[PDB]
Design a protein around this ligand. Structure first.
Ligand code: CLA
Ligand code: CLA
Ligand code: CLA
Ligand code: CLA
Ligand code: CLA
Ligand code: CLA
Ligand code: CLA
Ligand code: LMG
Ligand code: LHG
Ligand code: BCR
Ligand code: PQN
Ligand code: SF4
Lengths: 740, 73, 80, 74, 167, 134
């Protein structure tokens, strides 16, 4: 039933369809009568559901499309490791990581870029990167350039190998539908092999290669003296001297005498004092534990041998009193719509990516990461934004599933139909929460801003005045500090020093210290929840009311993406499921841009800084977060006006491009306001008068010009609005820490 | 760093016992124990096939590994 | 409430009457001996100004027009 | 208790020379298993009675959930 | 196989019993009967509140409503208002609380003079509430809210100010 | 009005206070088979074997539902307008023929014999109460 069925020679491989544009769609295949045909050519290129009503052809296109995408990611990664080999200071960073900055680029000696090739240490003049690959490759044990050179070539070979697969599958050997619908086989294979065995094999690296290499390097031996990884396998005397657990061999493993391997499989639960980062042995014990869990977890499902569940069975049983049939029918939707799968995967993968960034800063998992304050903010800020984008995509495809693939027969009194039937109560109460919080979250800032201007500093919501202490977070914080003793007693240190413990000092820099929570930190956590709630209100409303509304009952027939119904009914503007996503992106932004500042200003103020040998820490901004982060003027004064001094003064230095990129984004941003505020009606009339001038001089175009569509105008704006916003704070974050 | 273990024959007894719990837990619970790969005797092995054998034995090792280590505090 | 005016350039496509959600329009026989039919707007109180008919009419400029006017519960589409 | 290091409550018991309703020879333990008669009163140790009803209430609550009251479990 | 899988379709299963029902017998209606809306506990509480209690005059309803609100509104002005740390802190709460009662009574009589449409019926309160469907009933309600609201705030002032003597 | 209500548990979206006070609507149709159909406002419902009836807030929901019924090949959809006093009028089709198909009984109304470009300028009809389109 999970057999492999493959069609042979589905489609040829001729070049003629390249010459024929718009072949995928019938309307576009006719010809380009107007300029909107051009914009529609791109907007429908990847929408395979519109090209064909056949699910099998859609699935084959998607499966092959992923392979070409992996080629891009591998090529992007293969070039990263390549720049580390040739155009980089990696070999110098290894010997002196603290006092040498990481660089991987060399601008050429032309019109005047050469100032950007600044002195980053190690005899290399180049741009100071912030991706942290130097910390990654060091954890991988890559101690020379040739080891780095060989890895780049393998990615390109792996890249073309992925590319050959999509050709082999779409043109020569196409799997049929039933091969794709075997979700049970898919989950087992990915859980056990991709996630399980991939983690298990990586533990083989940590145990044989990285931890011996890292344990030597941090002990003071030069990279010249460090043996290569292969020598550890052949000669075990070098390894046994570092990790004596290997003298027993593999016999303690099978005899369950796993205490013999305690030397190199630890539960220290803390950062290495020498190199700011988690212990490599803890990361070896990490992956080995998780691989067994993933290997075990994948045998749950049936796959042709009668041993395992049917996901259809489990869902149907989970009905209850309040939910009539519960999860009956979801397996059909999930197995008959790619959009539903994309919605679940995007939404949780995006929430996953946000969860990574919160972990990576508190417990740095690489050597010499926390000392590089530049990398931590850029690494934190990057993933925080990626997850926000993907979560919004999850709501979009949730609506596309509804307008397109929702069958009322399947969804009859199930958990989904029962949700659509009381959508008004869900939104009305969520509307109340958004108004409740926005008053009592932002209004408190206004009250403090009003009182501090009135000259009444005792009436503010502050630490000295009326205080709103996060006792529940202070409560949970205290448990993790006292955990290593009582709960999970095998741990020596607390899980993260962010919760509590003692200041860890790598060189002169503090890697991590306890993050105290006060009224100012109370005043920001809810601002995220408030902005997150509104983002859900816009997006959730888009999913439920996409099919119908009291204003429009036939919203489904119009489609997921339509601008309006018309002027009447008071106005039907931005009513589609598409336009909800267009609005949610602005709130996905405002939800997210405060998160990166709450991380940026706090860590500079309370955590990041320089420490003296005596034990006195001098933070970067000196505790200004406590009293200034409770008023809107303090953010404008102490965070935006103050920290942006390096950017504007970056001209005539290596950071001068950040001053340009910080500024060019402001242009691109306001350029967005053209398309959001305006409307097509003005622009087509203006183009009409301009067309007359070309008719006069006989320069009239054959493809008759047309203004951008209504949905496109909203689309082009949010593209600029976000690109101008993110690119602005991108350079501000870079130039501030790269100087500080 | 837990203390060493010497691989006594008592550990072999616990593993055999832990399997027998899984096997009794398997037959009374598994819906489709029979499978395509058939075993030589349909009495000494019951209605189980080669998949159900590896399944019941595998869950037994999980329990036996937990018990042997759990008892070894 | 609204006023839907139908002009002389109709040709009897029957597309306007189909696109109307509220059934404001109707195709009636025209006294023209060789004119097959022509549209009408008998129940104008139920017009909801969505301009779907204006999008449907295929004349060079629209034989049918919907001029906005005094609003009411029906025209504003208020179920409440 | 909530941590789980329950043995602390039985650390310092009432000495044999304890005089009832006084602090002479007293202790701090609230649960013990001395298992015998108080010397002075010629009666059972009261700390055991506190420990006594604890273990019984745990079994009784555990014993209660056998049946199929409304939810189907039992 | 477990019996839980077989019993999912049977109506004897505790799952299949449904708590939610349509509003009344007509499912076309807007509301949905829920244990929050239509439980006997909530129905008893809401229907017996002063706004819905049977056999009460409009003046008696506002007095019960006002005495509660007057007693409630004293707190925020006293402890959290200005002059909260002073000898006259409790006095400022009495004036500010009565201030809202005047503004609240104004809105009541103001809403009253404008012809109020109706008092609606819902699942929690099936019958029409009271004679709140006329200017005369709402006006008497407003005058009663004023008397109770001024009295309730005075009571909270007397107890709060003289709490130490009560101890 | 005679018919069986489609079977659905209920929904927040539906009739509101307007229905009691102002012109609730009702749609009627006869089915050959009991089928699952999406309601005009949220959810799904099962039509009965014959003579279905559904109470509706706005006329737009009924005609929008009728287009869905035509997918199931049910063309005998009838709509009514129910005032609070109980007055029910055969509102959607005034005569048995549908609006699309011509019938002799009907008469043209709001027909402008002029072309649209031949309309007068508004300055010619200012301070008169006349409108250009009239
Ligand atoms: C070996 C050469 C080769 C040839 C001759 C063809 C030929 C064909 N393929 Mg095919 N294909 C190939 C390789 C090839 N393919 C490979 C390697 C894959 C795996 C990814 C696929 C996957 C694939 C799919 C999934 C589909 C086709 C389709 C088609 C047909 C139409 C394509 C067309 O006109 O659009 C030509 C389009 C381009 C030339 C643009 C492609 C751009 C590339 C792939 C991505 C570039 C990314 C780039 C880095 C982004 C930078 C952005 C920024 C810098 C601006 C045509 C018969 C389609 C079809 O049969 O329609 C029914 C179809 O659905 N192919
Ligand atoms: C993510 C993909 C990516 C990106 C953005 C870059 C970007 C860059 N590479 Mg590069 N590179 C990549 C992948 C990538 N590389 C891979 C995968 C390889 C191995 C095959 C290389 C091998 C490589 C070499 C050997 C060189 C560069 C160079 C350069 C720089 C000049 C580009 C140029 O002149 O364009 C030219 C564009 C066209 C001709 C079109 C620029 C920073 C040059 C450089 O930095 O010199 C100092 C240089 O010499 N790259
Ligand atoms: C796994 C990720 C993923 C995948 C596979 C898809 C796939 C799809 N999406 Mg989708 N989407 C995603 C994530 C994803 N989305 C996310 C994260 C969001 C939220 C932002 C959305 C929001 C979204 C909307 C609102 C819509 C889709 C639609 C679609 C479908 C057609 C799109 C199309 O024709 O492509 C072609 C797309 C384009 C040509 C747009 C180009 C956008 C460019 C890249 C923006 C510039 C960004 C760039 C980085 C800027 C710097 C460089 C520049 C200056 C040069 C297709 C099924 C459409 C639909 O209706 O589905 C049927 C639709 O209307 N998506
Ligand atoms: C700074 C600009 C700004 C502000 C203040 C708001 C405010 C709001 N938007 Mg919003 N919005 C904006 C820009 C803004 N928007 C932009 C640019 C867009 C386009 C992307 C949107 C798109 C948008 C959508 C799509 C949605 C909102 C929603 C909301 C509401 C959320 C509820 C809330 O916070 O409680 C109210 C809080 C405030 C108004 C904050 C200030 C209030 C202070 C504390 C009190 C004032 C003091 C005092 C009473 C003044 C009395 C003076 C007296 C003399 C009269 C709120 C009304 C959501 C909504 O309405 O649902 C609830 C929603 O769904 N907005
Ligand atoms: C929305 C956020 C917010 C909050 C929480 C506060 C809070 C406060 N402000 Mg303030 N203020 C705000 C916004 C806010 N402000 C804004 C936006 C401005 C600019 C216009 C000001 C300007 C301002 C000034 C100029 C002054 C204050 C003052 C005060 C204090 C006294 C409050 C008072 O007398 O009201 C009394 C409040 C009430 C009578 C009612 C409050 C609501 C109750 C608690 C609702 C409870 C609902 C309940 C839980 C539901 C029951 C459920 C049921 C089923 C039982 C207090 C700390 C004063 C001060 O000096 O501060 C120390 C003062 O002089 N405010
Ligand atoms: C002493 C020899 C011996 C051995 C090695 C086994 C071994 C086994 N018996 Mg078994 N059995 C035995 C004697 C034995 N039995 C006796 C004496 C009886 C009673 C007649 C049974 C009755 C029995 C039943 C009923 C079943 C097994 C089943 C099984 C197998 C399932 C567990 C597993 O390994 O997977 C296992 C291989 C299985 C199953 O269903 N056994
Ligand atoms: C006699 C039965 C028995 C006993 C006394 C123990 C005892 C223990 N187990 Mg254990 N275990 C058992 C059976 C048993 N196990 C079985 C049958 C399994 C298989 C499901 C496991 C799987 C298991 C895991 C996966 C873990 C424990 C852990 C533990 C330790 C306590 C962890 C905690 O938070 O408290 C403790 C030594 C934990 C441990 O030892 O951490 C150091 C731990 O992570 N147990
Ligand atoms: C906010 C508070 C949260 C509250 C959450 C708890 C709410 C309580 C939920 C109670 C659940 C009731 C279960 C109903 C199923 C039995 C009904 C039934 O048909 O009976 C199935 C049968 C009895 O069934 C009877 O069978 C008869 C024929 O024999 C007839 O058919 C009767 O009609 C039928 O009732 O047996 C059971 O009742 C026992 C089944 C085993 C139930 C195990 C419960 C434990 C499940 C734990 C879930 C595993 C995951 C936990 C770990 C997760 C890790 C994160
Ligand atoms: C209360 C917890 C939910 C308890 C809960 O959901 O109850 C769950 C309860 C269970 O019904 P069933 O047993 O039918 O569910 C069976 C499942 O298998 C079906 O998924 O259903 C309801 O009562 C519906 C109420 C939903 C609406 C409840 C209000 C939710 C408020 C929004 C969430 C607030 C989160 C705050 C904390 C972060
Ligand atoms: C649990 C619960 C709850 C809670 C409750 C509450 C919290 C209550 C409230 C409370 C209140 C709110 C109270 C108040 C009271 C008051 C009073 C007690 C009053 C008094 C009065 C008086 C006594 C007055 C008198 C007078 C007058 C009238 C006039 C003249 C003067 C005088 C002063 C004599 C609820 C229901 C929510 C829900 C469910 C559960
Ligand atoms: C400006 C604007 C327009 C008009 C925008 C237009 C017409 C953009 C046109 C962009 C390019 C530059 C058109 C020409 C592309 C040529 C192919 C470029 C020449 C080729 C060389 C560059 C190689 C809208 O249509 C619109 C619609 C709805 C809301 C807001 C707006 C809006 O703000
Ligand atoms: S021209 Fe317009 S109004 Fe006339 S028949 Fe065609 S669609 Fe109807």
């Amino acid at each position: 039933k999970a057999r492999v069925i493959v069609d042979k020679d589905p489609v040829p491989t001729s070049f003629e369809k390249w010459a024929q544009p718009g072949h995928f769609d019938r309307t576009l295949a006719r010809g380009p009568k107007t300029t909107t045909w051009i914009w529609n050519l791109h907007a429908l290129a990847h929408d395979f559901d519109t090209h064909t009503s056949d699910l099998e052809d859609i699935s084959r296109k998607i499966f092959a499309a992923h392979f070409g995408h992996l080629a891009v990611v591998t090529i992007w990664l293969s070039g990263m490791i390549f720049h580390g080999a040739k155009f980089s200071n990696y070999e110098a960073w290894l010997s002196d990581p603290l006092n040498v900055r990481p660089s991987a680029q060399v601008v050429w000696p032309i019109v005047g870029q050469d100032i950007l090739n600044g002195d980053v240490g190690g005899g290399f003049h180049g741009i100071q990167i912030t991706s942290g690959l130097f910390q990654v490759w060091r954890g991988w044990g890559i101690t020379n350039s040739f080891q780095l050179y060989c890895t780049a070539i393998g990615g390109l070979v792996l890249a073309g190998l992925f590319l050959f697969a999509g050709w082999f599958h779409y043109h020569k050997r196409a799997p049929k539908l039933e091969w794709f619908q075997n979700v049970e086989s898919m989950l087992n294979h990915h859980l056990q092999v991709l996630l399980g065995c991939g983690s298990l094999g990586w533990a083989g690296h940590l145990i044989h290669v990285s931890a011996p290499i890292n344990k030597l390097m941090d002990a003071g031996v030069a990279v010249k003296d460090i043996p290569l990884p292969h020598e550890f396998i052949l000669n075990k005397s070098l390894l046994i001297d570092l990790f004596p657990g290997f003298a027993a061999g593999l016999t303690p493993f099978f005899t369950l005498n796993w205490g013999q391997y305690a030397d190199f499989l630890t539960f220290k639960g803390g950062l290495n004092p020498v190199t700011g980062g988690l212990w490599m042995t803890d990361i070896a014990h990490h992956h080995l534990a998780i691989a067994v869990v993933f290997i075990i977890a994948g045998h749950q499902y049936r796959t042709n041998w009668g041993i395992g569940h049917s996901i259809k069975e489990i869902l149907e049983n989970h009905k209850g009193p309040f939910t009539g049939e519960g999860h009956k029918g979801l397996y059909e939707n999930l197995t008959t719509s790619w959009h539903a799968q994309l919605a679940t995967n995007l939404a949780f993968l995006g929430s996953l990516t946000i969860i990574i960034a919160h972990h990576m800063y508190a417990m740095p998992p690489y050597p010499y990461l926390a000392t590089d304050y530049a990398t931590q903010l850029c690494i934190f800020t990057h993933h925080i934004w990626i997850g926000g984008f993907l979560i919004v995509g999850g709501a979009a495809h949730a609506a596309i599933f509804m307008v397109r693939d929702y069958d009322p027969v399947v969804n009859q009194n199930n958990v989904l139909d029962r949700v659509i039937r009381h959508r008004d109560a869900i939104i009305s109460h969520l509307n109340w929460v958004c108004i409740f919080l926005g008053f009592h979250s932002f209004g408190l800032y206004i009250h403090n801003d009003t009182m501090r201007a009135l000259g009444r500093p005792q009436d503010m919501f502050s630490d000295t005045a009326i205080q709103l202490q996060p006792v529940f977070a202070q409560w949970v914080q205290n448990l993790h500090t006292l955990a290593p003793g009582g709960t999970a007693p095998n741990a020596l240190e607390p899980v993260s020093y962010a919760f509590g413990g003692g200041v860890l000092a790598v060189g002169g820099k503090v890697a991590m210290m306890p993050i105290a929570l006060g009224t100012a930190d109370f005043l920001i956590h809810h601002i995220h929840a408030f902005t997150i709630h509104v983002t859900v209100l816009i997006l959730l409303k888009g999913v439920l009311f996409a099919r119908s509304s009291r204003l429009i009952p036939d919203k489904a027939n119009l489609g997921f993406r339509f601008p309006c119904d018309g002027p009447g009914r008071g106005g039907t503007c931005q009513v589609s499921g598409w336009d909800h996503v267009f609005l949610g992106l602005f709130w996905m932004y405002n939800s997210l841009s405060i998160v990166i500042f709450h991380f940026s200003w706090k860590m500079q103020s309370d955590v990041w800084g320089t420490v003296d040998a005596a034990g006195n820490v001098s933070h970067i901004t000196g505790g200004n977060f406590a009293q200034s982060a409770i008023t809107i003027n303090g953010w404008l004064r102490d965070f935006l006006w103050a920290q942006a001094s390096q950017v504007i003064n970056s001209y005539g230095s290596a950071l001068s491009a950040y001053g340009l990129m910080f500024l060019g984004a402001h242009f691109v941003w306001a350029f967005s306001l053209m398309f959001l505020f305006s409307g097509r009606g003005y622009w087509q009339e203006l183009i009409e008068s301009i067309v007359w001038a070309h008719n006069k001089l006989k320069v009239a175009p054959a493809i008759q010009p047309r203004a951008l569509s209504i949905t496109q105008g909203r689309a082009v704006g949010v593209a600029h609005y976000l690109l101008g916003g993110i690119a602005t704070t991108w350079a501000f974050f870079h130039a501030h820490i790269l100087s500080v | 760093a837990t203390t060493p273990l010497e691989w006594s024959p008592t550990v072999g007894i616990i593993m055999v016992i832990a399997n027998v719990i899984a096997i009794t837990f398997g037959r009374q619970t598994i819906k489709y124990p029979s499978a395509e790969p058939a075993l030589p005797s349909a009495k000494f092995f019951g209605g189980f096939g080669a998949p159900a054998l590896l399944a019941t034995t595998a869950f037994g090792h999980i329990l036996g590994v937990g018990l042997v280590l759990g008892l070894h505090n | 409430s609204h006023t839907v005016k139908i002009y002389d350039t109709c040709i009897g496509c029957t597309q306007c009457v189909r696109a109307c959600p509220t059934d404001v329009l109707e195709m009636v026989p025209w006294d023209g001996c060789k004119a097959a039919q022509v549209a009408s707007s008998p129940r104008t109180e139920d017009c909801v100004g969505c301009k779907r008919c204006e999008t449907a009419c295929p004349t060079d400029f629209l034989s049918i027009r919907v001029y906005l006017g005094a609003e009411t519960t029906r025209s504003m589409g208020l179920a409440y | 208790f909530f941590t789980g290091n329950w043995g602390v409550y039985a650390q310092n018991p009432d000495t044999a020379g304890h005089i009832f309703s006084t602090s002479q020879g007293a202790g701090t333990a609230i649960l013990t298993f001395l298992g015998g008669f108080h010397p002075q009163t010629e009666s059972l140790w009261l700390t055991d009675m506190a420990h006594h009803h604890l273990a019984i209430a745990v079994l009784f609550i555990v014993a209660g959930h056998m049946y199929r009251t409304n939810f189907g479990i039992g | 196989a477990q019996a839980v899988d077989a019993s999912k379709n049977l109506p004897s299963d505790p799952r299949n019993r449904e708590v939610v029902f349509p509003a009344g017998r007509d499912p076309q209606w807007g509301n949905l009967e829920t244990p929050v809306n239509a439980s006997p506990l909530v129905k008893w509480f809401i229907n017996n509140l002063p706004a819905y209690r049977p056999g009460l005059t409009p003046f008696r309803r506002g007095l019960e409503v006002g005495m509660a609100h007057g007693y409630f509104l004293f707190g925020p002005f006293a402890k959290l208002g200005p002059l909260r740390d002073a000898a006259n802190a409790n006095l400022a709460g009495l004036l500010g609380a009565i201030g809202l009662v005047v503004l609240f009574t104004l809105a009541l009589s103001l809403y009253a003079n404008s012809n109020p449409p109706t008092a609606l019926a819902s699942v929690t309160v099936p019958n029409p509430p009271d004679a709140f469907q006329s200017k005369e009933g709402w006006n008497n309600f407003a005058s009663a809210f004023l008397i109770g609201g001024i009295g309730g705030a005075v009571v909270a002032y007397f107890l709060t100010s003289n709490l130490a003597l009560i101890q | 009005l005679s018919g069986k209500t489609p079977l659905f548990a209920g929904s927040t979206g539906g009739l509101l206070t307007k229905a009691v006070e102002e012109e609730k609507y009702a749609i009627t149709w006869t089915s050959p088979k009991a089928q699952v159909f999406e309601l005009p406002t949220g959810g799904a419902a099962t039509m009965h074997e014959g003579e279905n009836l559904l109470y509706i807030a706005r006329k737009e929901y009924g005609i929008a539902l009728g287009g869905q019924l035509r997918k199931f090949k049910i063309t005998n959809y009838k709509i009514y307008r129910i005032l609070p006093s109980g007055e029910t009028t055969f509102i959607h089709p005034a005569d048995g023929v549908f609006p699309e198909k011509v019938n002799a009984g009907r008469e043209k109304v709001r027909f402008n014999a002029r072309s649209i470009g031949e309309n007068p300028n508004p300055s010619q009809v200012k301070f008169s109460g006349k409108a250009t389109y009239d």
